[PDB]
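User: Here's a protein and a ligand (glutathione). What would the complex look like?
Assistant: Let me lay out the input and then the predicted complex.
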Amino acid sequence: SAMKLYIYDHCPYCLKARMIFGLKNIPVELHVLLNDDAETPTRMVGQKQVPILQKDDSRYMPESMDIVHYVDKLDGKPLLTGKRSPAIDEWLRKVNGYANKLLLPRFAKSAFDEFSTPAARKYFVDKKEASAGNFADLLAHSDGLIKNISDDLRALDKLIVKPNAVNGELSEDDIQLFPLLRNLTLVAGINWPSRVADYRDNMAKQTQINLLSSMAI
Ligand SMILES: N[C@@H](CCC(=O)N[C@@H](CS)C(=O)NCC(=O)O)C(=O)O
Protein backbone atom coordinates (compact mmCIF):
# COMPACT_ATOMS: atom_id res chain seq x y z
CA SER A 1 0.00 0.00 0.00
CA ALA A 2 1.36 3.39 -1.06
CA MET A 3 -1.32 6.08 -1.03
CA LYS A 4 -0.15 9.69 -1.24
CA LEU A 5 -1.92 12.79 0.01
CA TYR A 6 -1.23 16.21 -1.53
CA ILE A 7 -2.00 18.99 0.94
CA TYR A 8 -1.47 22.33 2.56
CA ASP A 9 -0.66 21.92 6.26
CA HIS A 10 -3.04 24.75 7.29
CA CYS A 11 -5.96 23.51 5.18
CA PRO A 12 -8.85 22.10 7.24
CA TYR A 13 -10.09 19.99 4.31
CA CYS A 14 -6.62 18.43 4.12
CA LEU A 15 -6.80 17.81 7.87
CA LYS A 16 -10.08 15.91 7.37
CA ALA A 17 -8.35 13.59 4.89
CA ARG A 18 -5.33 13.19 7.18
CA MET A 19 -7.61 12.26 10.07
CA ILE A 20 -8.97 9.05 8.54
CA PHE A 21 -5.49 7.62 7.90
CA GLY A 22 -4.54 8.30 11.51
CA LEU A 23 -7.74 6.84 12.95
CA LYS A 24 -7.35 3.65 10.93
CA ASN A 25 -3.57 3.54 11.42
CA ILE A 26 -3.05 3.36 7.66
CA PRO A 27 0.29 4.76 6.51
CA VAL A 28 0.10 7.60 3.99
CA GLU A 29 2.80 9.65 2.28
CA LEU A 30 2.20 13.39 2.76
CA HIS A 31 3.33 15.84 0.12
CA VAL A 32 2.89 19.51 0.97
CA LEU A 33 2.37 21.56 -2.19
CA LEU A 34 3.51 25.16 -2.39
CA ASN A 35 0.50 27.45 -2.06
CA ASP A 36 1.11 29.12 -5.44
CA ASP A 37 1.42 25.82 -7.33
CA ALA A 38 -1.52 25.65 -9.73
CA GLU A 39 0.18 23.36 -12.24
CA THR A 40 0.48 20.29 -10.02
CA PRO A 41 -3.12 20.01 -8.81
CA THR A 42 -4.41 21.05 -12.24
CA ARG A 43 -2.51 18.17 -13.84
CA MET A 44 -3.85 15.77 -11.19
CA VAL A 45 -7.56 16.65 -10.97
CA GLY A 46 -8.17 19.48 -13.43
CA GLN A 47 -8.09 22.51 -11.15
CA LYS A 48 -6.19 24.04 -8.25
CA GLN A 49 -7.47 22.41 -5.05
CA VAL A 50 -6.31 20.30 -2.11
CA PRO A 51 -6.49 17.70 -0.69
CA ILE A 52 -5.78 15.27 -3.51
CA LEU A 53 -5.41 11.55 -2.82
CA GLN A 54 -3.28 9.40 -5.11
CA LYS A 55 -4.56 5.83 -4.96
CA ASP A 56 -2.51 2.64 -5.31
CA ASP A 57 -3.46 2.46 -9.00
CA SER A 58 -1.97 5.97 -9.50
CA ARG A 59 -5.39 7.57 -10.07
CA TYR A 60 -6.01 10.89 -8.31
CA MET A 61 -9.11 11.81 -6.37
CA PRO A 62 -10.04 15.23 -4.96
CA GLU A 63 -12.56 16.15 -2.23
CA SER A 64 -11.89 15.65 1.47
CA MET A 65 -15.10 13.78 2.30
CA ASP A 66 -14.84 11.53 -0.78
CA ILE A 67 -11.34 10.67 0.41
CA VAL A 68 -12.57 10.04 3.97
CA HIS A 69 -15.42 7.79 2.82
CA TYR A 70 -13.12 5.92 0.41
CA VAL A 71 -10.44 5.22 3.02
CA ASP A 72 -12.91 4.31 5.78
CA LYS A 73 -14.54 1.65 3.57
CA LEU A 74 -11.40 0.13 2.07
CA ASP A 75 -10.98 -2.62 4.68
CA GLY A 76 -14.72 -3.31 4.85
CA LYS A 77 -14.82 -2.09 8.46
CA PRO A 78 -15.75 1.63 8.62
CA LEU A 79 -14.84 3.50 11.82
CA LEU A 80 -17.12 6.51 11.27
CA THR A 81 -20.27 4.77 12.43
CA GLY A 82 -21.43 7.10 15.18
CA LYS A 83 -24.41 9.42 15.09
CA ARG A 84 -23.87 13.06 14.09
CA SER A 85 -25.36 15.93 16.14
CA PRO A 86 -27.50 18.77 14.80
CA ALA A 87 -26.16 20.96 17.63
CA ILE A 88 -22.55 20.37 16.51
CA ASP A 89 -23.55 21.16 12.94
CA GLU A 90 -25.09 24.46 14.10
CA TRP A 91 -21.97 25.28 16.16
CA LEU A 92 -19.62 24.68 13.22
CA ARG A 93 -21.84 26.78 10.92
CA LYS A 94 -21.50 29.65 13.38
CA VAL A 95 -17.80 29.38 14.15
CA ASN A 96 -16.64 28.65 10.60
CA GLY A 97 -18.53 31.85 9.78
CA TYR A 98 -15.81 33.93 11.44
CA ALA A 99 -12.83 31.82 12.54
CA ASN A 100 -10.76 32.72 9.49
CA LYS A 101 -10.66 36.32 10.77
CA LEU A 102 -8.26 34.90 13.36
CA LEU A 103 -6.76 32.06 11.37
CA LEU A 104 -5.84 33.56 7.99
CA PRO A 105 -3.51 36.35 9.14
CA ARG A 106 -1.86 33.86 11.50
CA PHE A 107 -1.45 31.15 8.84
CA ALA A 108 0.23 33.83 6.71
CA LYS A 109 2.89 34.42 9.38
CA SER A 110 3.51 30.77 10.27
CA ALA A 111 6.04 28.11 9.31
CA PHE A 112 3.89 25.82 7.17
CA ASP A 113 5.65 24.11 4.26
CA GLU A 114 3.12 25.44 1.72
CA PHE A 115 4.56 28.90 2.45
CA SER A 116 8.23 27.81 2.33
CA THR A 117 9.04 29.98 -0.68
CA PRO A 118 8.49 33.68 -0.11
CA ALA A 119 6.57 33.78 -3.42
CA ALA A 120 4.11 31.18 -2.09
CA ARG A 121 3.63 33.09 1.15
CA LYS A 122 3.05 36.34 -0.76
CA TYR A 123 0.55 34.62 -3.06
CA PHE A 124 -1.42 33.57 0.03
CA VAL A 125 -1.19 36.99 1.70
CA ASP A 126 -2.41 38.79 -1.43
CA LYS A 127 -5.27 36.39 -2.13
CA LYS A 128 -6.49 36.28 1.47
CA GLU A 129 -6.15 39.98 2.24
CA ALA A 130 -8.36 40.57 -0.80
CA SER A 131 -10.97 38.02 0.31
CA ALA A 132 -10.84 38.31 4.12
CA GLY A 133 -9.65 41.90 4.55
CA ASN A 134 -6.47 43.69 5.61
CA PHE A 135 -4.41 41.47 7.93
CA ALA A 136 -3.17 44.23 10.25
CA ASP A 137 -6.77 45.26 10.76
CA LEU A 138 -7.89 41.69 11.42
CA LEU A 139 -5.05 41.29 13.93
CA ALA A 140 -6.02 44.55 15.63
CA HIS A 141 -9.41 42.97 16.34
CA SER A 142 -7.88 39.78 17.80
CA ASP A 143 -8.99 40.31 21.39
CA GLY A 144 -12.64 40.79 20.39
CA LEU A 145 -12.57 37.72 18.15
CA ILE A 146 -10.74 35.68 20.83
CA LYS A 147 -13.51 36.56 23.29
CA ASN A 148 -16.02 35.24 20.76
CA ILE A 149 -14.10 31.99 20.24
CA SER A 150 -13.69 31.46 23.98
CA ASP A 151 -17.41 32.02 24.52
CA ASP A 152 -18.28 29.64 21.69
CA LEU A 153 -15.88 27.05 23.14
CA ARG A 154 -17.75 27.32 26.44
CA ALA A 155 -20.91 26.30 24.59
CA LEU A 156 -19.05 23.48 22.82
CA ASP A 157 -17.77 22.13 26.15
CA LYS A 158 -21.29 21.01 27.05
CA LEU A 159 -21.55 19.04 23.78
CA ILE A 160 -18.34 16.98 24.14
CA VAL A 161 -19.77 13.60 25.23
CA LYS A 162 -16.42 11.78 25.58
CA PRO A 163 -12.82 12.95 25.21
CA ASN A 164 -12.28 10.42 22.40
CA ALA A 165 -15.37 11.17 20.29
CA VAL A 166 -17.49 14.30 20.34
CA ASN A 167 -20.80 12.40 20.27
CA GLY A 168 -19.63 9.37 22.26
CA GLU A 169 -18.80 7.19 19.26
CA LEU A 170 -16.46 8.18 16.40
CA SER A 171 -18.45 10.01 13.74
CA GLU A 172 -18.18 12.46 10.88
CA ASP A 173 -18.66 15.19 13.50
CA ASP A 174 -15.12 14.45 14.68
CA ILE A 175 -13.91 14.84 11.10
CA GLN A 176 -15.67 18.21 10.86
CA LEU A 177 -14.77 19.54 14.33
CA PHE A 178 -11.18 18.56 14.99
CA PRO A 179 -9.55 20.41 12.07
CA LEU A 180 -11.03 23.67 13.36
CA LEU A 181 -9.90 22.99 16.94
CA ARG A 182 -6.45 22.03 15.68
CA ASN A 183 -6.11 25.25 13.71
CA LEU A 184 -7.39 27.34 16.62
CA THR A 185 -4.34 26.23 18.66
CA LEU A 186 -2.40 28.68 16.48
CA VAL A 187 -4.34 31.49 18.22
CA ALA A 188 -2.63 32.62 21.41
CA GLY A 189 -4.92 33.75 24.20
CA ILE A 190 -7.92 31.49 23.70
CA ASN A 191 -9.40 30.19 26.93
CA TRP A 192 -9.86 26.45 26.36
CA PRO A 193 -12.53 24.72 28.48
CA SER A 194 -11.34 21.44 30.06
CA ARG A 195 -13.53 19.00 28.13
CA VAL A 196 -12.75 20.71 24.80
CA ALA A 197 -9.04 20.74 25.65
CA ASP A 198 -9.15 17.05 26.61
CA TYR A 199 -10.97 16.14 23.38
CA ARG A 200 -8.53 18.24 21.32
CA ASP A 201 -5.54 16.48 22.89
CA ASN A 202 -7.10 13.02 22.68
CA MET A 203 -8.11 13.36 19.02
CA ALA A 204 -4.69 14.77 18.11
CA LYS A 205 -3.15 11.54 19.38
CA GLN A 206 -5.74 9.33 17.65
CA THR A 207 -5.14 11.06 14.33
CA GLN A 208 -1.43 11.74 14.78
CA ILE A 209 -1.94 15.34 13.68
CA ASN A 210 0.14 18.04 15.39
CA LEU A 211 -1.35 20.80 17.51
CA LEU A 212 0.15 24.25 16.95
CA SER A 213 0.70 25.89 20.37
CA SER A 214 4.48 26.11 19.78
CA MET A 215 3.70 28.46 16.88
CA ALA A 216 0.82 30.29 18.54
CA ILE A 217 0.59 34.03 17.91
N1 LIG B 1 -14.63 20.66 -1.24
C1 LIG B 1 -13.22 20.66 -1.12
C2 LIG B 1 -12.74 22.03 -0.70
C3 LIG B 1 -11.23 22.06 -0.58
C4 LIG B 1 -10.69 23.48 -0.57
O1 LIG B 1 -11.43 24.43 -0.76
N2 LIG B 1 -9.26 23.65 -0.34
C5 LIG B 1 -8.71 24.97 -0.36
C6 LIG B 1 -7.58 25.17 0.62
S1 LIG B 1 -8.23 25.40 2.25
C7 LIG B 1 -8.18 25.18 -1.77
O2 LIG B 1 -7.63 24.27 -2.35
N3 LIG B 1 -8.36 26.43 -2.37
C8 LIG B 1 -7.88 26.68 -3.68
C9 LIG B 1 -6.55 27.40 -3.59
O3 LIG B 1 -5.89 27.31 -2.53
O4 LIG B 1 -6.14 28.07 -4.58
C10 LIG B 1 -12.77 19.70 -0.03
O5 LIG B 1 -13.81 19.01 0.61
O6 LIG B 1 -11.68 18.93 -0.42
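Summary: The chain is about 50% helix and 5% strand.
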